[PDB]
Design a protein around this ligand. Structure first.
Ligand SMILES: *[C@](O)(C(=O)NC1CC1)[C@H](CCCC)NC(=O)[C@@H]1[C@@H]2[C@H](CN1C(=O)[C@@H](NC(=O)NC1(CS(=O)(=O)C(C)(C)C)CCCCC1)C(C)(C)C)C2(C)C
Ligand SMILES: *[C@](O)(C(=O)NC1CC1)[C@H](CCCC)NC(=O)[C@@H]1[C@@H]2[C@H](CN1C(=O)[C@@H](NC(=O)NC1(CS(=O)(=O)C(C)(C)C)CCCCC1)C(C)(C)C)C2(C)C
Ligand code: NA
Lengths: 306, 306
C-alpha cells in the first residue's frame, strides 16, 4: 500500500533528449526518427524576446547555425522548418533509440511525466497536471526549455508537452509537439492574462478514493449530496463543476470501495466548508487534485510498462 | 523556477530489473554483472512467513527452482547464496546494460529515488527519504518486493535500498544491497516495534530556503534564535535536534539567500508554534522534510547526469 505522486519510468524518453544551440542560446530538443523538435525561440536574442518576428529571425538562419549534440556526438542538420511554435530540425541520422511514439494534445485535468533536462542531459522526473487554465506547476530553470511531458501506454510514449516559458506566478506554459501552445499564451516576453487556477474536482475525488483504499477514512461521514447541491458549494471554492461523465469515470473506484461518488462528494463538501482541522489525508494537509482516476486505479492496481 | 519532489532519471536502473519466481512467489530482482539480487523471502510459503527458518527453507532449493526472466528472455541460474536478507543468484550472462554502480548504506535523513516494479517491469519512479526511524513512505503493492532505491552521481548509480515489507502504519522497510535491514526490522510476519517518526529539521530548513529562492517569503520574520533555544522548541514537536554540522551543510543556501540559518530557525519556530494560518509554502500546507540541502542546491542550480 501507500500512495505517491509517481512519474513514468523515463528511460525511453532519456534516449531522445539532445542539446540544441543557436547563437548564445542552448536548450533541449526531442530527437525522434530523423527530426529534432525544439522551441522556435532558440533563434532569439534577449532583445528579440520582447517583440519577436519569428519569420524574420528564422530567415537569417541556415542548417549549419543549429548545433545539435546527442551526448558527445554532433548531429548533421539537413533541414529546418517552423511548425507553429516549434522548430523541426531534419538530421541525417534516425535516432536508433526512437521508441514507439505518438503526439497527443492532452485535455485539462490530465496528468503527465516531465523529464527536466539541461544541455540535453536528463536532470530528473516528476508528475504534472495540465491545470484548467492550461499552466503546469513544474520545476524549470534556465536551460530547461525543450524539456518534454509524456505518458507511456505499455510500450508507446505519448508526448504531450514541450516546455517554453514561465508566468509571473511561477507556473509554466508550453506547447504540444505540433507547437500549439496550451491555453491563450504566445511566445513573446509581454504581459499576458492567465485564467483563474480552478481545482480539478474529479481528481480530488479520485484521491479521496485512493485515501480510503489506503485506509485513511476519518473524513467519511453519514451524509450524501446531489450533483447540483455539490456544484453550488464547489463553485464558491473555485472547483470545476462535477458532471455525470466524472461520476462514470470514478466507477472503478466507487466499485472497489463500495462508496457512491455522491457520498464521497458529501465528504469533500464538509472538508471544503470545515477544512481539515489540522489532520492529513495521504500525508497531505491540502486536497490533492493532480491525480486522475486512471492514475489512482493504475497505482492502486499496479499495472506496468516496457 | 518552481520546486518539485523530483526523482533521478530511471533509465540506467530500468535496464537492471528482472522477474524472479520461486514456487508461487513472483517478485523483482536487480541484475548487475552476472548476479541477480532479490529478497530471501522469495523462497517462503505464506505459512513460512510467520516464523521462517531461512537456512532450512533455502536447503530445499536448487538453482533450477529460481526462475529469472529479463523481459521475455530466461536467464540460467548457475549459483545461489544468501547474504543477510538477500539472495544472490549467479547467472551465466553478465547484464549488458550494467551501469557503473556501487552499493551504499544511506544515512537517516538522506533521500533516494524508488523505481517501483511489478513482475520485473518498471511501473513508476518517485523520491523517498530514509526516515529517522529507518522506514520510508513509499507506494508498494503485492509484487513490488525487490524494487530498489538509488541515487545517480553523474554516471554512477548508488543503490541503497531494496523493498521487503510493509509496517501496520503503511510505511515501508527494506535492506541495503548487502541485505542488512535499515532499522531494527527482521523479515518475519510478527509484531515489531517501529520508532517514533521524527521530522528531519535540516531538510525542513533546506525546503524553507528553496521557498525563499522561489519567492515564497511570507514566513520570514524579524526574529532570530540560538541552536539551544530552537532545539528546546523543536523537541516538543518531535523534530531532530539541529547541530552545527547541519548549519554548515546549509551554507550554500544561507550564502545564496543571505539569510542566516538561525534567522530561518526563528521562522520555523513561529511556523511550528503558530501553524501556517491556512497559507501554503511551495504549494504545501505542511512543513516538507524529504528534501536534503543537496537536493535543494541541485534543483535550484540544475546540475544533470548520464
Ligand atoms: C527557455 O527558453 C530556456 O531554458 N532557455 C535557455 C537559455 C537558457 C526559457 C526558460 C526561462 C526560465 C525557466 N524560456 C524563456 O526564456 C521564455 C522565452 C522569452 C522569455 N521567457 C520566459 O519564460 C519569461 N517569461 C515570460 O516572458 N512570461 C510571460 C510574460 S510575464 O512573465 O508576465 C512578464 C511580462 C515578463 C512579467 C510571457 C509568456 C506567457 C507567460 C507570461 C521569463 C524569462 C521572464 C521567465 C519567451 C519567448 C517567452
Ligand atoms: C513482497 O515480498 C512482494 O511483493 N511479494 C510478492 C508476491 C507478491 C511483499 C510485499 C507486501 C505488500 C507490499 N512482502 C511481504 O510479503 C512481507 C514478507 C512477509 C510479510 N510481509 C509484509 O510486508 C507484511 N507485513 C509485515 O509482516 N510487517 C511486520 C508485521 S506487522 O505488520 O506489524 C503485523 C504483525 C502483520 C500486524 C513485520 C516486518 C516488519 C514490519 C511489521 C504484510 C503482508 C502484512 C504487509 C515478510 C517475510 C515480512
Ligand atoms: Na500539504
Amino acid at each position: 500500500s501507500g500512495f505517491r505522486k509517481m512519474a513514468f519510468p523515463s528511460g525511453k524518453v532519456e534516449g531522445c533528449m539532445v542539446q540544441v544551440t543557436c547563437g548564445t542560446t542552448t536548450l533541449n530538443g526531442l530527437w525522434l526518427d530523423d527530426v529534432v523538435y525544439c522551441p522556435r525561440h532558440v533563434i532569439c536574442t534577449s532583445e528579440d524576446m520582447l517583440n519577436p518576428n519569428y519569420e524574420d529571425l528564422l530567415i537569417r538562419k541556415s542548417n549549419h547555425n543549429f548545433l545539435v549534440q546527442a551526448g558527445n556526438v554532433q548531429l548533421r542538420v539537413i533541414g529546418h522548418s517552423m511548425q507553429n511554435c516549434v522548430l523541426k530540425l531534419k538530421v541525417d541520422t534516425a535516432n536508433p533509440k526512437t521508441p514507439k511514439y505518438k503526439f497527443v494534445r492532452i485535455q485539462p485535468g490530465q496528468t503527465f511525466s516531465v523529464l527536466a533536462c539541461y544541455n540535453g542531459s536528463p536532470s530528473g522526473v516528476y508528475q504534472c497536471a495540465m491545470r484548467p487554465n492550461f499552466t503546469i506547476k513544474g520545476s524549470f530553470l534556465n536551460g530547461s526549455c525543450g524539456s518534454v511531458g509524456f505518458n507511456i501506454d505499455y510500450d508507446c510514449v505519448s508526448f504531450c508537452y514541450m516546455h517554453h516559458m514561465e508566468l509571473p506566478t511561477g507556473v509554466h506554459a508550453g506547447t504540444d509537439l505540433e507547437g500549439n501552445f496550451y491555453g491563450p499564451f504566445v511566445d513573446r516576453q509581454t504581459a499576458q492574462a492567465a485564467g483563474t487556477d480552478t481545482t480539478i474536482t474529479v481528481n480530488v475525488l479520485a484521491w479521496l478514493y485512493a485515501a480510503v483504499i489506503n485506509g485513511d477514512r476519518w473524513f467519511l461521514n453519514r451524509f450524501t449530496t446531489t450533483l447540483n447541491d455539490f456544484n453550488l458549494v464547489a463553485m464558491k471554492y473555485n472547483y470545476e463543476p462535477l458532471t455525470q461523465d466524472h461520476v462514470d469515470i470514478l466507477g472503478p473506484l466507487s466499485a472497489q470501495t463500495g462508496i457512491a461518488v455522491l457520498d464521497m462528494c458529501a465528504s469533500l463538501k464538509e472538508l471544503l466548508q470545515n477544512g481539515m482541522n489540522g489532520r492529513t489525508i495521504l500525508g497531505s494537509a491540502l486536497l490533492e487534485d493532480e491525480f486522475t482516476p486512471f492514475d489512482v486505479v493504475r497505482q492502486c492496481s499496479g499495472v506496468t510498462f516496457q
